[PDB]
Symmetry: C3
Amino acid sequence: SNFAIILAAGKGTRMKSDLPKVLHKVAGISMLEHVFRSVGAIQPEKTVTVVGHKAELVEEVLAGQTEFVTQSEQLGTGHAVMMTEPILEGLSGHTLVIAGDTPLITGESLKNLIDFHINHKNVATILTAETDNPFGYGRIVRNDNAEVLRIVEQKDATDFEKQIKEINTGTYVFDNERLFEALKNINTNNAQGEYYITDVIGIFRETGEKVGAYTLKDFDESLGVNDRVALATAESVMRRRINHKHMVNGVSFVNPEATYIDIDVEIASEVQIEANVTLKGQTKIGAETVLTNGTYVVDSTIGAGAVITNSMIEESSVADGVIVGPYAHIRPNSSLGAQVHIGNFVEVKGSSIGENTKAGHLTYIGNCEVGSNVNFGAGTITVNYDGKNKYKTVIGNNVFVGSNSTIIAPVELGDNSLVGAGSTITKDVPADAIAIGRGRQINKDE
Amino acid sequence: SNFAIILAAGKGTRMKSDLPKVLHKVAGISMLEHVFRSVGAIQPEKTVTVVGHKAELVEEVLAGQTEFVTQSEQLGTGHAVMMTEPILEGLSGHTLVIAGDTPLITGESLKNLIDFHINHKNVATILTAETDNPFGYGRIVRNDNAEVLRIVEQKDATDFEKQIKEINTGTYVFDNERLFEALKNINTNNAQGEYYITDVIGIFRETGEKVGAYTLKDFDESLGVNDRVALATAESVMRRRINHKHMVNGVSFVNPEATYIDIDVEIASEVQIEANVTLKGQTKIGAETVLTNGTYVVDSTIGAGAVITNSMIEESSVADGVIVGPYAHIRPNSSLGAQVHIGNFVEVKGSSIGENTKAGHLTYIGNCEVGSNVNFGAGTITVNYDGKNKYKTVIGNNVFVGSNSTIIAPVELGDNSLVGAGSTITKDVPADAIAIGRGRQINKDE
Amino acid sequence: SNFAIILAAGKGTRMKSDLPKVLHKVAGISMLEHVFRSVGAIQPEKTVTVVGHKAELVEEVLAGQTEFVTQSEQLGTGHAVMMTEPILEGLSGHTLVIAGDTPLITGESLKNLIDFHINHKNVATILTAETDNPFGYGRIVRNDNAEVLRIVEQKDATDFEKQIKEINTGTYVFDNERLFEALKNINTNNAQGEYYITDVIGIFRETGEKVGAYTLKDFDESLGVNDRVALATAESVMRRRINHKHMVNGVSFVNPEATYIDIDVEIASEVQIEANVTLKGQTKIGAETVLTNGTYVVDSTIGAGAVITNSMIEESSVADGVIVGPYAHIRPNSSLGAQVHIGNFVEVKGSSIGENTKAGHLTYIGNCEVGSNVNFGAGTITVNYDGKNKYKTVIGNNVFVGSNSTIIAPVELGDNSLVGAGSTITKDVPADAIAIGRGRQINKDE
Ligand SMILES: CC(=O)N[C@H]1[C@@H](OP(=O)(O)OP(=O)(O)OC[C@H]2O[C@@H](n3ccc(=O)[nH]c3=O)[C@H](O)[C@@H]2O)O[C@H](CO)[C@@H](O)[C@@H]1O
Ligand SMILES: CC(=O)N[C@H]1[C@@H](OP(=O)(O)OP(=O)(O)OC[C@H]2O[C@@H](n3ccc(=O)[nH]c3=O)[C@H](O)[C@@H]2O)O[C@H](CO)[C@@H](O)[C@@H]1O
Ligand SMILES: CC(=O)N[C@H]1[C@@H](OP(=O)(O)OP(=O)(O)OC[C@H]2O[C@@H](n3ccc(=O)[nH]c3=O)[C@H](O)[C@@H]2O)O[C@H](CO)[C@@H](O)[C@@H]1O
Ligand SMILES: [Mg+2]
Ligand SMILES: [Mg+2]
Ligand SMILES: [Mg+2]
Ligand code: NA
């Protein structure tokens, strides 16, 4: 029986933020969520998240996914684990304690940790790693025969102890029953005057209880994020992880070290992604689609065989074979039908665009229902706002909207209609009709 | 006498692509072409490229540059070399065998390899290297006195052999006459059930024939591209190589690790290139020209003293002192004369623009022949498409095209003419004349 | 008493530039300025900058901040120091000699260097470092008991000496009085036929004078920039330094290795900066402001809570809560009031924009004084240029400028006025009035 305790009540002073540290994002989701996803790998029967500093913000993120306990005052990591007593005290099993600021630890690593704990029949197992720059991390102190003696914090470590490269990742597995009894013996006699969870290791050794340490196969997973310098490193490692997975899946990257793809983004095989492409949120990219430098897609679905050249697309659906850009902007609630062509300096907002329709230049399409095979001449402006209300415009199939025209909603351009270039349309244009609304040209010789 | 055999018939399963692996691009050209260019350094009397999987695509790339032999079934690298028998069997000389998926090996390295082979009078010389992650590479097995015994593939290697860091690059030089006789002794008794070319090393040792190994000076050249993770590494190394050459040539780079310049791009001294600039194909950049972040140039010629700010330029010519951007788009078959200024949100397509002409904002110039010292007011739209045909517009010198005007082709604006702002022009405007075609302003008090 | 000598007279041949090497920029300022800033840390009583090659360009950069001496001919680093004789000869104190092409050395390092020199009572102290690629650097030659014997240049070094990893940084501290007497003994007997300053070390040893070497704590500071490859490395290290400082200060960076922020840019806590953001010159960013990929800001002030999405802003002021982009361009001498919204494909030039005003699409606002709560419809074009003169337009508060309208200066749109969409305005529109200037729509059935 496995139990889990996630610490997320800290102040995170070094972050210099009003937003709780654990909520800072890494590849699209908070560090806390990355940790929560890893925890699920051990299939815990009970999950408790310790909240305190701005608990309401934290509870909203994991609402309905974990039990919450409040730590009124941030008196220490050990004190935080004590808050889980009313829920876990008495139960029999292996209790995992993990920090909410170590977003790189994988579920696979946590599984190996618990398996090690059970196999070696330890009362406490520490997840460790080694690094050439252990500053800020608790050091793992062992004796001559490599037996774990205790964990000494940076601020409490001697110069000899500071030289230790083996660090505490902040993740452990404790025998649930022995954990809460050992917690009662933690004192505040240290540089911070806090209840260190790291002290339970020394406490267990007093009664000769078995304590071990499982070393991470990948030391990059050990990153503890206390400031924004560490947060950038987490972004770097997570970015490499995500992009590596995509490349193994058959996605080409001109530069995986400079491409920004969120954790839950899905990408089909044969997709070509240039450097400096950004894909955020619930974004999906179809097979063989090409994304060029500067393309920025948020919560959108893009089909197969599409080519998105240096363009921004938000909360929209893009069908197969759609060509967009460069410098195009597809705003929320828009839908581009199959083989639609949206060129440079074109903005589509809250509009549905039928198959094969083209708007290649300096055009604004807002709140419009557009048919198939429609052609928007360069400079076409649709007007949906008058100062108070928002009106809709309907454009039929095979409509030819003349260049530099101004279409004032609410109006409807019937099938096969034509709007003369430079015209201002304020009234419906019947199907197959031709509308012209501009001044006559007069030349004055000189 | 040197001969060359390039293997390009494989399936490249790990790539997860319909495009033959060797055809995947690195810095603008296929891996196969990079390998072909290196091969030329040995000045081979005969060059044979083994094709099989989608041979027609491969033959098109190197058409008229090498002899081709078909390998109906991909039974192995050794089997592939056997396909070159009808052409190379009997001839006397040093035969180089190279894979089409090792695009980083230089011609200089191949020259050193053949020179080593001849000097040491070997029957077979293997191009080797060392790496901390030899996974997937054939390991070089030597005895106590560092003599090459054989090459063992990843899938056939024991745990002891897998620990070997010295890898086979897939490039060798064989005595042509002894090569084809040793090929007859290759068996399919291995994990893949294939005819390994790597086995000829062991076969030569049976008759006490001299086999050696030449080690690469630069281990980065040893990269074997079997998947897209490796392809990204190839892009990274090739990108560093290309940009290093440019910096030595006097080109400044804010960030050479994040600048994307194709293999055949030419850049003059004193050019300043910000990070995230992309130069593709047959692009040439003149002296002292400045390219800012986001600029993307494809198959174009840009002169000296030009400033291309965050703009995309395709298949066009840009003269000296031209200023473009930010967010400008120069489309195919366009020509910008000396000191032309193209500003933000301006698109030029299939048009010639005379010296000193300015179009600084929200303008579309398509299929136009424009003179010198012309001024396009912001919002100027030229119309060349009516729904079926494409018409041309001619604009003379010193013409002042009023802002937000719509010029409907085919029309001609004579020298020194002026088009009033907001006008729709459907007829020719004589030289020195003034054309106005808009509605009169009426104010309604309230 | 501390004195300083900065060498900036060299030709910098490897740079292949008409601009003196020391003037090449690193993070917004010349290498010379970075060196000058570091020098100030030792609080020198006298500062002398040796100029020669294009001295006028160099003197302009540090005008009024240092004394200048001319080196007519570039006969060597030793010869350059000799030019400072008329000013420093006779004085008593510690004289620091530093190259103008080592922009990474910090003031803290120079302080530690002088303190070492004084403490050890040396006649000469060399600032050294160690590197695996010492090519081009003078090597530090020591004896069995680690005593500094001399400095041997790359071109004069034997194969044994070339293997030395300890390099000369080009920075030293000499006893002023003994310095000028030792300079008289420097000869041109070397590969370059120049007067090496490095030779004074050997000269001092002839009379048994105390010479030492202080080693840099950070070897990255030792970079000597002789070509553009080294200049890119300097940019890389300086970029990392600058961004690290910002992260410690509470600024988040998606990718600090690919974000370009100049040396004097100021950024408040809680600011979020995506990768590929460029901030240049005297730019200041307020608290909680978000900067997305592609944003490029030069000499501008941006307030708190602003969101600059993929936009370019130059020499302008942006107030709190302003939303800009994507693909917007704020040109010189513009001011955006609190909560102003500037959308895609909008250019603002030399204009003041009042609070809450919105221009969300394809609009050009030039030389305009705009009030508060004004709404610019998509496609709105302001005209300020007629061919010779520049005219101003004044727009009152709560004005509704209809889409695709053309406003021809000089004109004034009074408070609460409205311009009908597609209108060309050539005359003043009184407050509360409605102006319409377009052609009537005529439909022709078919
Ligand atoms: C005493 C202790 O455990 N030290 C460990 C902690 O140091 P470190 O100094 O990083 O500890 P933090 O301040 O980041 O706290 C760790 C976690 O506990 C939380 N928290 C903190 C204080 C509190 O009163 N309530 C609460 O819930 C924080 O929100 C965070 O999720 O993690 C490092 C690894 O990353 C380890 O090397 C250290 O050995
Ligand atoms: C058996 C063999 O040679 N193994 C070598 C091969 O492994 P590796 O597993 O990389 O071999 P690949 O599958 O990439 O084949 C190598 C080359 O031969 C071609 N090909 C393959 C099979 C075929 O039947 N016909 C054909 O033409 C492929 O197109 C490719 O150009 O290259 C590695 C270096 O990169 C070496 O370390 C391995 O020792
Ligand atoms: C002889 C000498 O000093 N060599 C040092 C110099 O080599 P390095 O070959 O780099 O010397 P440079 O040519 O860059 O000259 C150094 C500095 O002196 C200036 N200059 C040069 C020649 C001249 O006649 N007048 C003049 O003012 C240059 O402008 C530059 O600021 O710096 C390296 C560190 O970066 C050291 O490892 C070398 O030991
Ligand atoms: Mg922590
Ligand atoms: Mg291979
Ligand atoms: Mg130098
Ligand atoms: Na217009």
